[PDB]
Amino acid sequence: MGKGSSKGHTPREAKDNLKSTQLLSVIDAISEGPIEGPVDGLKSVLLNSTPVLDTEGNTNISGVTVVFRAGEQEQTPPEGFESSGSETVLGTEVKYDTPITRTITSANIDRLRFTFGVQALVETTSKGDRNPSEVRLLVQIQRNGGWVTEKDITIKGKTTSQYLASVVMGNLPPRPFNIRMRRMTPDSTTDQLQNKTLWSSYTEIIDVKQCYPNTALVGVQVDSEQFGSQQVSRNYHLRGRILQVPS
Amino acid sequence: NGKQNTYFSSLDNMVAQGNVLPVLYGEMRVGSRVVSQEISTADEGDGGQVVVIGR
Amino acid sequence: VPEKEAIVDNGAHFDGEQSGTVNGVTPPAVQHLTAEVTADSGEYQVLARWDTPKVVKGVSFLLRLTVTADDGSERLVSTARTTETTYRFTQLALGNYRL
Amino acid sequence: MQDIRQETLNECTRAEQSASVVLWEIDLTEVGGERYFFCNEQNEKGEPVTWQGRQYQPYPIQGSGFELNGKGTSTRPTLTVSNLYGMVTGMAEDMQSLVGGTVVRRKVYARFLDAVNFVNGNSYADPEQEVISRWRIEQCSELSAVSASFVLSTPTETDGAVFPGRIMLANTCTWTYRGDECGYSGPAVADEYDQPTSDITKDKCSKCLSGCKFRNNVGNFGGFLSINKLSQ
Ligand code: SF4
Numbered sequence: 001m002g003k004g005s006s007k008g009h010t011p012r013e014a015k016d017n018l019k020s021t022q023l024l025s026v027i028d029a030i031s032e033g034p035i036e037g038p039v040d041g042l043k044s045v046l047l048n049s050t051p052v053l054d055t056e057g058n059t060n061i062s063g064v065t066v067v068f069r070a071g072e073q074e075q076t077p078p079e080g081f082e083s084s085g086s087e088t089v090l091g092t093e094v095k096y097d098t099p100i101t102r103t104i105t106s107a108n109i110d111r112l113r114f115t116f117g118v119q120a121l122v123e124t125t126s127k128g129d130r131n132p133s134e135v136r137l138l139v140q141i142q143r144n145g146g147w148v149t150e151k152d153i154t155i156k157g158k159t160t161s162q163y164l165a166s167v168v169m170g171n172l173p174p175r176p177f178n179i180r181m182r183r184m185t186p187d188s189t190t191d192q193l194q195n196k197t198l199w200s201s202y203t204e205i206i207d208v209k210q211c212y213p214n215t216a217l218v219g220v221q222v223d224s225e226q227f228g229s230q231q232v233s234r235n236y237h238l239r240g241r242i243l244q245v246p247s
Numbered sequence: 248n249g250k251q252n253t254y255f256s257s258l259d260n261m262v263a264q265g266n267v268l269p270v271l272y273g274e275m276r277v278g279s280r281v282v283s284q285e286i287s288t289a290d291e292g293d294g295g296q297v298v299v300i301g302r
Numbered sequence: 303v304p305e306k307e308a309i310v311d312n313g314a315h316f317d318g319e320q321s322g323t324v325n326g327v328t329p330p331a332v333q334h335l336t337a338e339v340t341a342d343s344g345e346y347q348v349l350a351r352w353d354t355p356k357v358v359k360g361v362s363f364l365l366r367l368t369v370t371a372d373d374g375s376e377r378l379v380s381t382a383r384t385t386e387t388t389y390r391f392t393q394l395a396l397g398n399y400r401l
Numbered sequence: 402m403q404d405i406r407q408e409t410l411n412e413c414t415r416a417e418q419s420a421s422v423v424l425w426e427i428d429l430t431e432v433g434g435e436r437y438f439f440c441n442e443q444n445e446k447g448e449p450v451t452w453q454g455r456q457y458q459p460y461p462i463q464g465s466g467f468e469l470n471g472k473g474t475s476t477r478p479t480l481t482v483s484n485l486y487g488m489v490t491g492m493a494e495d496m497q498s499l500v501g502g503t504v505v506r507r508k509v510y511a512r513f514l515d516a517v518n519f520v521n522g523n524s525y526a527d528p529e530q531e532v533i534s535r536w537r538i539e540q541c542s543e544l545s546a547v548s549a550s551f552v553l554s555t556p557t558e559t560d561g562a563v564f565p566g567r568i569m570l571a572n573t574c575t576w577t578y579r580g581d582e583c584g585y586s587g588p589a590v591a592d593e594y595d596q597p598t599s600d601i602t603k604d605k606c607s608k609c610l611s612g613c614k615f616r617n618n619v620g621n622f623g624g625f626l627s628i629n630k631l632s633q
Pocket residue numbers: 574575576577578579582583584585606607608609610612613616618619621622623
């Protein structure tokens with residue numbers, strides 16, 4: 001799927017009842033100089049001893065984001081890997097009428113992570129019981145003069161206490177920035193339906209700035225929950241150096 | 248125990264400090280020298296616009 | 303060459319963070335630790351949820367559940383070690399619990 | 402077989418042959434010196450031997466241990482030269498004991514020498530009849546008030562080398578400053594102690610992360626700035 005770079009990305013399975021997801025981000029160094037690359041593709045990445053894709057194309061493992069890098073001198077850093085983060089807490093409620101906005105206007109940011117959530121999600125009825133609530137929120141960027149939506153998020157669940165999520169985005173224009181997150185659901189007028197939202201904090205990501213000039217890195221970013229408590233042993237069915245062979 | 252190793256292969260993810268950078272010459276299934284390995288919390292939402300958390 | 307010595311004790315400019323980059327790969331504090339007392343199953347149960355911080359090479363979790371005494375002291379109810387990001391407590395007597 | 406001309410092979414089989422003259426050349430141009438040309442003898446006119454139009458100055462010089470063996474240790478010839486009048490001494494204090502230089506040895510039958518060497522001339526003079534061998538100076542083994550002996554080695558000599566050579570380190574760059582892999586071409590920024598300088602002759606990299614940041618070259622940093630914590 002290309003030479004010098006690759007993306008892989010077998011999709012993640014949809015979750016059932018909220019819950020977090022542990023992520024395992026690795027970066028493995030192989031060989032020197034320009035190498036040919038994988039023998040086949042995503043079927044050449046073995047997570048413990050099993051290829052990601054079955055020999056027929058079926059996904060043995062879901063949630064893998066291999067990003068191959070050859071050994072070319074002019075490379076680019078492996079995207080999606082962080083190096084440092086700056087977390088600022090602004091925990092406030094988000095009402096239908098009022099958005100929030102914070103005007104980060106930093107200088108050395110690379111990606112933006114939003115920590116939103118809901119304080120509760122039960123839908124109580126008379127005589128008892130509870131049901132989901134269908135909360136909806138929207139994250140928008142300044143984009144000069146027009147607030148274009150970046151990430152709209154819908155949450156279904158029961159819960160009883162605070163639940164927090166996160167959303168990442170990039171492509172950030174220059175930085176007289178204005179971010180925004182606003183509410184879509186009307187409000188919790190009644191007492192039996194509590195669906196209050198909240199914007200706990202936001203994080204600034206600086207990512208990896210070192211494009212390792214001549215090694216061949218891989219990077220995986222696989223969810224670590226599917227595997228057991230044991231460590232993950234990544235293996236690669238690669239090809240070798242691009243030699244200087246006679247014409 | 249009785250396993251035989253060679254001088255031209257490795258299926259291990261070895262330590263990568265003061266340990267030189269290997270060289271691969273054609274084909275082969277290889278281990279690696281782990282450069283970074285961190286466990287964090289995955290952030291829901293991959294690309295596009297619509298994100299649904301609970302279903 | 304008696305003048306060699308002066309060059310030797312002129313060690314280069316090490317970058318910084320002499321103390322060890324102020325981490326010592328010590329894991330940060332777990333975040334979003336929420337307890338939830340529920341009875342929708344027909345009996346009292348406690349669900350504890352938390353989010354994994356950024357760690358190195360892997361992670362596990364240590365849980366310590368204690369109950370408050372009448373004199374303000376504490377009694378150790380239970381201890382556990384896990385790899386999951388959720389836990390469940392059942393059959394708890396009345397009191398003020400700290401996890 | 403060696404690629405040598407038919408005239409030399411014809412001369413080799415003769416019962417009565419001419420004298421074999423060995424001409425030497427010391428090439429210190431790659432180490433910052435000059436080229437010297439020597440022959441153990443003068444010619445019949447009391448002049449330095451002229452080969453291919455080049456004069457080889459007379460000087461007592463003798464080589465030994467020349468052989469071609471693939472099995473075992475790499476062959477290490479020796480070259481003994483006169484150190485009367487402190488000539489080689491003058492080279493040892495100017496060229497770091499001549500180490501790293503080149504020694505070129507030519508075997509030529511005297512019948513093929515240039516016509517200027519002989520009073521009656523040379524009708525069979527042929528400047529293309531020579532056997533050439535190149536070696537490197539490894540160590541001036543002995544140097545005294547009388548002579549000087551040099552150890553020679555084949556240019557390959559995989560003695561101190563290792564493979565693979567690039568080493569994985571943190572907090573240190575293994576690239577060569579302003580080299581191909583470093584890929585830096587900016588102005589003078591600082592010296593090896595990170596102190597800022599606008600002097601190009603005092604511009605060197607500390608090989609630390611701060612030195613790379615001084616040049617905004619962190620992308621091309623030759624180190625791996627995470628391995629220091631995974632090795633615990
Ligand atoms: S630290 Fe940066 S500037 Fe210095 S030699 Fe290495 S790559 Fe070049």
